[PDB]
Structure formats: structure tokens, C-alpha cells
């Protein structure tokens, strides 16, 4: 059951077929499937305690000893140092859910682990793993269409942001930043609404700068309809505030020009030397005069400048920033309405951006300064500035806000919304059970198993919330059947009601559909594996 082939010959002569056949291993058949299922079950049972509002976090430590506290399944499984190839498949599964959706990264893993755990029982009874995979595909199609059936729709306009704030709060219910729950949800909504081609088009996250600075309180996290930069004004005697700032964005270093081609300017006389000297002087003066003549009150270069240029900027009352990065230059241009200029000669009053406030901000006893550009007219860019007492909660807040933004993005892509708290999973399990009562006997064990696996998310939520899994799940299932109401789920917060439509617990239809589809497809590819030849 291991060690590749071992016979060596029925004639006594050496039998070498594969390189290092003696050092290599292999698992064949049902034992391989059982190993896969145990690996997946271990990963899923690790993750299931980080599910729901009452879900707990995991503290990941990397190779170099940095700590990451998180509830995000994708971050956990990415930081997790796995050596089992089936656990790697689960890491890839969660990564896929995060890529496509940005939420559900823990639901996919828990659900896939449950599907494989139930296939384990089905294989024991002797069913072909492919028949199990096909029954799972059938039930997954049934559950997907049933989600389309029980789904709801929300308004994605900028005038009624309550359905979106409710969705974002549902997303952020399970994260440490629920201490500023609504404060966080609001800004995620506003962010995606500020930066979006709202004709059901895409949302480019490059337009959302998520910056964090230790210090302050989580309550200080805010949305800046503009940009924040980690720089300050180039000269220490420049002013730290500029109101009604006309901004010149420049990618030309404030230095004498220099050709890119190999060049040698030859000085052959004192007259040449004096001409060179005055050429340098006049270049500096001409640059500053062109910046003044365009009407700018502020300059922003990407490539830094020198002593003469800095002092001339100060003398001419032109506050200036240097060494700004390409992405930040782009964001400043997009936000202030300005155009990026490659040389001073090409600078005009129309290419300038406008920001109603440019400020230099301090952070206590640090010596660190930041530059805020805001009060723009119609900034199509935005920044989320996060504060906090430690780098762990700052990084967790960053990823939590990424989840919230991704949820609002998914709403802009499809406004349809299913209700969570395990209610959608219970309803889909009921639908799969109903359709299983109709299919022939043999693909019925696999559809019943798919239903029993879908029912693991409500069980996990109740368990994490201290409730008794079986009791709570059976009660809400019975209520769902009796009073037709696919919004009945687990009262994780113990608000009394089991109706998630009243508690404003909201999930995205694309989110649940993607969870189901990804879990089923990966479970299928795993049941289809029956041999491992690891070295």
C-alpha cells in the first residue's frame, strides 16, 4: 500500500522502473480517498470555529515571527503552512472564493469539508466516488436554482444606502471592527459608491487607498474623499496648510535637464564655463517662474528636487511635495481633477488640479507627517484612513474593510440578495431533500448527503454561539417548512427573533452561489483523485 512497486523480479535480476522508486511513496484506491477526506475534514474543522458573529480568531505566526490575528479564512489558509496536497486544494479553494467574491472564504472550506465528510460515509456503503460527485453536482444545481428562487433584491442607488449599510454590517458582524460596526459599514458603502461606474459596471479597487497608521482609536478611522500621502512639504519653513490649492502635478525632477542618450557637454573656455553656470541658474529660475505663471499654489513632483529649486519654491510662496510615488501621483491627479505633466514647458492653468484643502498632519510624539488632499469637487478617488492601538487590529481592520468593499462591489454587480444566518443553507437543504424524494434511489444517497452537508453552516453558527446545534437547526427547519419563510435561521446574537429578514442579516446571492459552486467543483475534483505518488 506504499513504496511504489516491490517485486524486484521473478527471475532474481534487478527491477528498476521509476527513478528513486525506493524513496518514493504511493497511495491507491479507497485509502487514498480516506486520507484526502481526513485532511479536508481537519482543515474544515479548524476553520469552522471562525464562522459567524460569535466566531473566534486565529493567530498566525510566519517564518520570521510576525503575528497576524484574523477571522478571514483566506488569510488563515494562506498563512497556514500545509504540506498535504488536499489541504493545499482547500487553500486554493478559499483563495478562489476571495478572488471572485471577497467574502465566504470560510464558508467554502467548511462546506467542502462537510461534503467530503459525508462522501466518506457514502464510500463506506460502497458507492463509486464518481457517482457521489455526480449526485453532488445535481444537488448543487438544485441549490443554486433554489437560491435564485428565494433571492431578494436591494436598491444600489446612492440615495438609499440603508440596504447597503445593512449588507456591509452583516459582512462586518464577524470581524473585530464591529466595535465601530456602523461607522465601518457606512464608509465601505460610501467608498464603493464614490469610486464606481455605477451602470452595473466594475469597481476598480485601485481607486480606494486603504492606509493605516498606528495611533489614535478605531473610531478615528474615516473616509477622505481624496488622497493621503506619507510625505510632507519639501522645505521645513513652508506652510503646513493650503486652502483653495491649485495643484501642479509633475513627473519632472526640478533639476537641470538631462538627455537619456549618452551625452558629453564639453567646456573648452572660461566663456563656456560662465555660460554653463548661468544656464543652470536660469533653468532653476525658469522652472519656478513657469510654475508660478500657471497660477499654481502647490506643486507635487514624483522625482524629488534640489536645494536651489527648494529654496526658490519657498521664496515664491509655492509649497511643494517631492518623491511622491507613481500610484499616489495618479490618485492625486484623479482626485483633484488635474492632469499629470511631464515637463514644465507643458504646464498650463487647465492641467492643474484643485483641492479645497491640502494639510500636513501629525501623529503625536512621532516626527511622522502625512499629507491630506481633500475637499475636491468630484474626486473619483477615495482613501480609508485607519487608526488603532496596534498593528494587528489595523491589519485586521484593513482586511475586514476589504471584505465589506468586496460585498458592496458584488451588490453593484448584481443587486440580488439572499438572507443569511444559515437560513439560505437550510432552505437549499430542504429543496435538495424535496428533489431527492423524486429522483431514483441510487442518486438519492448523494443528494441527501449534499443536504446534510449544507446543513453544517447553521450547525456551525449555533455551536459557535453556544446554542445546541441539532435542537436549533431542527426547530428552524420545521418552522421553515411550516411557515414558508427562507429567512429563518440561527439567532447568533440572541435578538429573540429567528427571522434574519428582520434582523437585517443579508448575504449576496452571488456569494452563496459561488460558495456552493466552488465547494462542489473542488469536492468533485478531490473525489476524482484515487492515487498519490509523492516523493
Amino acid at each position, epitope marked *: 500500500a506504499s513504496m511504489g512497486t516491490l517485486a524486484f523480479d521473478e527471475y532474481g535480476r534487478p527491477f528498476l522502473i521509476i527513478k528513486d522508486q525506493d524513496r518514493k511513496s504511493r497511495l491507491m484506491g479507497l485509502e487514498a480517498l480516506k486520507s484526502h477526506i481526513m485532511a479536508a475534514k481537519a482543515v474544515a474543522n479548524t476553520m469552522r470555529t471562525s464562522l459567524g458573529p460569535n466566531g473566534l480568531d486565529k493567530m498566525m505566526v510566519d517564518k520570521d515571527g510576525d503575528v497576524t490575528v484574523t477571522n478571514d479564512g483566506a488569510t488563515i489558509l494562506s498563512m497556514m503552512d500545509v504540506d498535504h496536497q488536499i489541504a493545499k486544494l482547500m487553500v486554493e479553494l478559499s483563495k478562489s472564493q476571495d478572488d471572485e467574491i471577497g467574502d465566504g472564504t470560510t464558508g467554502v472550506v467548511v462546506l467542502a469539508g462537510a461534503l467530503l465528510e459525508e462522501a466518506e460515509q457514502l464510500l463506506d456503503r460502497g458507492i463509486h466516488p464518481i457517482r457521489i460527485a455526480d449526485g453532488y453536482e445535481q444537488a448543487a444545481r438544485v441549490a443554486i436554482e433554489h437560491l435564485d428562487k*428565494i433571492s*431578494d*433584491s436591494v436598491l444600489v442607488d446612492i440615495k438609499d444606502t440603508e440596504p447597503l449599510i445593512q449588507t456591509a454590517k452583516t459582512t462586518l458582524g464577524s470581524k473585530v471592527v464591529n466595535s465601530c460596526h456602523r461607522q465601518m459599514a457606512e464608509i465601505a458603502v460610501n467608498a464603493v459608491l464614490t469610486v464606481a461606474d455605477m451602470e452595473r459596471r466594475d469597481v476598480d479597487f485601485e481607486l480606494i487607498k486603504v492606509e493605516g497608521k498606528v495611533g489614535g482609536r478605531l473610531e478615528d478611522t474615516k473616509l477622505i474623499k481624496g488622497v493621503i500621502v506619507d510625505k510632507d512639504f519639501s522645505h521645513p519653513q513652508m506652510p503646513k496648510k493650503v486652502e483653495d490649492a491649485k495643484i501642479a502635478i509633475l513627473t519632472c525632477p526640478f533639476e537641470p535637464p538631462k538627455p537619456k542618450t549618452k551625452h558629453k557637454l564639453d567646456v573648452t573656455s572660461v566663456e563656456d564655463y560662465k555660460a554653463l553656470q548661468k544656464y543652470e541658474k536660469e533653468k532653476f529660475e525658469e522652472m519656478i517662474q513657469q510654475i508660478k505663471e500657471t497660477g499654481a499654489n502647490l506643486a507635487i513632483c514624483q522625482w524629488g528636487f534640489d536645494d536651489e529649486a527648494n529654496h526658490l519654491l519657498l521664496q515664491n510662496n509655492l509649497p511643494a511635495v517631492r518623491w511622491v510615488g507613481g500610484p499616489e501621483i495618479e490618485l492625486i491627479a484623479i482626485a483633484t481633477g488635474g492632469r499629470i505633466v511631464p515637463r514644465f514647458s507643458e504646464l498650463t492653468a487647465e492641467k492643474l488640479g484643485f483641492a479645497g484643502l491640502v494639510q500636513e498632519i501629525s501623529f503625536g510624539t512621532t516626527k511622522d507627517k502625512m499629507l491630506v488632499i481633500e475637499q475636491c469637487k468630484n474626486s473619483r478617488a477615495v482613501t480609508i484612513f485607519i487608526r488603532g492601538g496596534n498593528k494587528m487590529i489595523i491589519e485586521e481592520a484593513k482586511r475586514s474593510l476589504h471584505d465589506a468593499l468586496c460585498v458592496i462591489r458584488n451588490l453593484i454587480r448584481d443587486n440580488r440578495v439572499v438572507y443569511g444566518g444559515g437560513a439560505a443553507e437550510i432552505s437549499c437543504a430542504l429543496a435538495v431533500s424535496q428533489e431527492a424524494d423524486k429522483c431514483p434511489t441510487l442518486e438519492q444517497y448523494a443528494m441527501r448527503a449534499f443536504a446534510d452537508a449544507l446543513e453544517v453552516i447553521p450547525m456551525a453558527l449555533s455551536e459557535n454561539s453556544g446554542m445546541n446545534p441539532i435542537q436549533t437547526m431542527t426547530e428552524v427547519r420545521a418552522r421553515q417548512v411550516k411557515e*414558508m419563510n*427562507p429567512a429563518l435561521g440561527i439567532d447568533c446574537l440572541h435578538k429573540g427573533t429567528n427571522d434574519m429578514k428582520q434582523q437585517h442579516v443579508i448575504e449576496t446571492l452571488i456569494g452563496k452561489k459561488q460558495q456552493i459552486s466552488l465547494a462542489t467543483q473542488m469536492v468533485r475534483m478531490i473525489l476524482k483523485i484515487d492515487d498519490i505518488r509523492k516523493p
Partner: nanobody
Amino acid sequence: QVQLVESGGGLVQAGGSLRLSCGASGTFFRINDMGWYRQASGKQRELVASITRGGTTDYADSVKGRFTISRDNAKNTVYLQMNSLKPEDTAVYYCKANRNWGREWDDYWGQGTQVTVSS
């Protein structure tokens, strides 16, 4: 999506009594409310009465107390037994069904049944 059938007709003034049924089929998961409406020629459609899933029925003002609207949830159908018929009760009877959370795009109307008359 929601296919609605209505069985009615047969006006009678000899004492006056009729019963009109309305049955729903198709794609849905819940019929939150079922209502009977009236539309005459040159008149505005009104609500005879309406019943909820819990059986709770609200009647109208110009006619009330003689209503026997009953809802079979086992087949998601409704039956209106109306008595004391009169010439102004002679109109088109429409059925209404709110489904799947009860949003404004969830009201489904029938084709309406016009109540015949002899000569």
C-alpha cells in the same frame, strides 16, 4: 412566471349568491396575500376583500358582512362566496397574489372574470 386561473361567472338575482375561485401555479415559494378586485366599464378597480396567510381577512366599506372568502394553503388557492348580488356588483372580478417577500414587483393579477347576464 406565476400562472393564475380563475373560475367564476353565473350572476343570479333570485336571492343572490355566487362563488368564484382563483388558483395559482408556477415559480414562487410563498403567497403572502390573495385579493379579489372589481373593475367595471368606466370605473376604477377596487378591493372586494383580501385574506392573509394567517387567514386574517379585511373587507371593504361599500360591501361587508356577507363575505365568505376562504384560503386553501395546501394548494395556494382562494374561494369567494359572495351573497346578496345586485346590478352594481356586475363587473370583472380580478385576482391578486403577492409573493416572495411581498415587494411591489410581486403583485400578480389574473385575467379577470366578467359576470354574465341573461336577457
